[PDB]
Amino acid sequence: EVQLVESGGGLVQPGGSLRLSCAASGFRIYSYYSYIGWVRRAPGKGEELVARIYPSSGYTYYADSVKGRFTISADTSKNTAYLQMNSLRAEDTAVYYCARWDFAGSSGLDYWGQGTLVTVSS
Amino acid sequence: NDLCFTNVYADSFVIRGDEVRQIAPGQTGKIADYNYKLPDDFTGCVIA
Numbered sequence: 664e665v666q667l668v669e670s671g672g673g674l675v676q677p678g679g680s681l682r683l684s685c686a687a688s689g690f691r692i693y694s695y696y697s698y699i700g701w702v703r704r705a706p707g708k709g710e711e712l713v714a715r716i717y718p719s720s721g722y723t724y725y726a727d728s729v730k731g732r733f734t735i736s737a738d739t740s741k742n743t744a745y746l747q748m749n750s751l752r753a754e755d756t757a758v759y760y761c762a763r764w765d766f767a768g769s770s771g772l773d774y775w776g777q778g779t780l781v782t783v784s785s
Numbered sequence: 786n787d788l789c790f791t792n793v794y795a796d797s798f799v800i801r802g803d804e805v806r807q808i809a810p811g812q813t814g815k816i817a818d819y820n821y822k823l824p825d826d827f828t829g830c831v832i833a
Contacts, residue, residue, distance in 0.1 A: 665811060665825065666812070758803070773811060774812075775806050775812065777813075777814050778803065
């Protein structure tokens with residue numbers, strides 16, 4: 664029942680952009696202060712944190728490697744987290760995954776989506 | 786180690802590395818849903 668459901672991967676031209684979408688199924692995001700972010704695994708790498716959005720607090724947080732280019736947003740009516748990746752480069756090819764952090768007094772990313780591949784190439 | 790059980794079951798299988806994350810409570814996917822599923826209320830260990 665409770666799961667992270669995602670789609671939106673594909674091929675993007677460097678300098679352009681691609682948007683990913685991860686739906687919250689079995690739970691709501693805003694009303695429970697649940698936080699949904701994105702993680703990526705570039706070829707040759709392990710997991711890298713990309714961004715997290717907290718609609719209930721009105722905040723977005725980012726990893727240093729994507730600051731200034733990637734924007735994380737959410738639609739609280741559609742109960743969906745989105746990652747808007749602008750100014751993509753070949754180095755950003757990765758499988759992108761959505762992941763769930765609940766508010767806390769520790770916490771962490773326990774729920775994961777399936778992942779989708781974002782290929783950035785000319 | 787401080788928790789006593791009547792039985793501990795060591796369930797064993799081989800999967801693709803990107804599906805390791807599906808052997809877990811709270812998960813869905815081709816392995817989590819059709820091959821080997823853990824309960825959301827899983828109090829055990831997933832070792833890979």
